[PDB]
Curated annotation (Swiss-Prot), chains A, B:
Keyword Lipid metabolism: yes
Organism: Pseudomonas putida (Arthrobacter siderocapsulatus)
Assembly and interaction partners: Homodimer.
Protein name as it appears in the record: Steroid Delta-isomerase
Inducing factors: By steroids.
Length: 129, 129
């Protein structure tokens, strides 16, 4: 059934753990086979597990990327949620941090149907070595 | 024109200041005249400045309510943003704090076209006397 608010908190928190260790296959499992991803929100969408896998492959492949929740997962009672987190990454050759909020909607099986990532240059912080 | 990422950060931050002081008129001023509010997200949307005003009147009238940002506004390049904040209020006769994330979309006039408040009881915390 459509995930309860508690279940949403659990799923979304796990997603971040998966990102943090680059478990691309487990991430793909979390998504519905016809999921949509808009990251960053504002840019053209990608659809389907094949593309989504490709997107995560290039985002989390190669460069060393970390991710951790910086605040509680906000969860609705209609199978959606939103979470604030921080992504650590190398940007323009240097260690940087990016503040992001993800919004996700889940289907009746508990798979991610939709994911939108809110961030831009204004949320980017280069970290003086 | 459509608010830049930096303007979105400023608009959304100002919105919170206006909720905090309960300036209903100034809050509705920020909305586009055919805007929609979904709060809690999941609940049927309310449409139009008149219905929106009534919502804020009943939400911010009577009981004492404060709000403040708990992190940076995340902003995209299509006039959209998301923000984490905390709402302080009396819930069931007892002072409580609610963690919320609002998603907003602005129009070409810098007015709010859509507002979606992600929160539920899982994000509610009763303060102990
Ligand atoms: C893609 C990325 C690494 C991972 C990542 C970014 C931004 C938003 C994200 C949102 C997610 O839900 C999961 C991963 C990312 C970074 C932006 C630039 C960078 O290299
Ligand atoms: C409405 C409310 C006080 C204000 C408020 C709540 C929830 C989400 C909000 C989102 C906003 O963008 C502005 C104000 C609120 C609380 C939930 C219960 C309560 O009384």
């Amino acid at each position: 059934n459509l995930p309860t608010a508690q279940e949403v908190q659990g799923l979304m928190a796990r997603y971040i753990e998966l990102v943090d260790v680059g478990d691309i296959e487990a991430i793909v499992q979390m998504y519905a086979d016809d999921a949509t991803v808009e990251n960053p929100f504002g840019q053209p969408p990608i659809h389907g597990r094949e593309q989504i896998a490709a997107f995560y492959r290039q985002g989390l492949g190669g460069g060393k990327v970390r991710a951790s929740l910086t605040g509680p997962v906000r969860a609705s009672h209609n199978g959606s949620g939103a979470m604030p987190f921080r992504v650590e990454m190398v940007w323009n050759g240097q260690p940087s941090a990016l503040d992001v909020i993800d919004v996700m909607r889940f289907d009746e099986h508990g798979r991610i149907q939709t994911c939108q990532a809110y961030w831009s240059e204004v949320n980017l912080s280069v970290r003086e070595p």
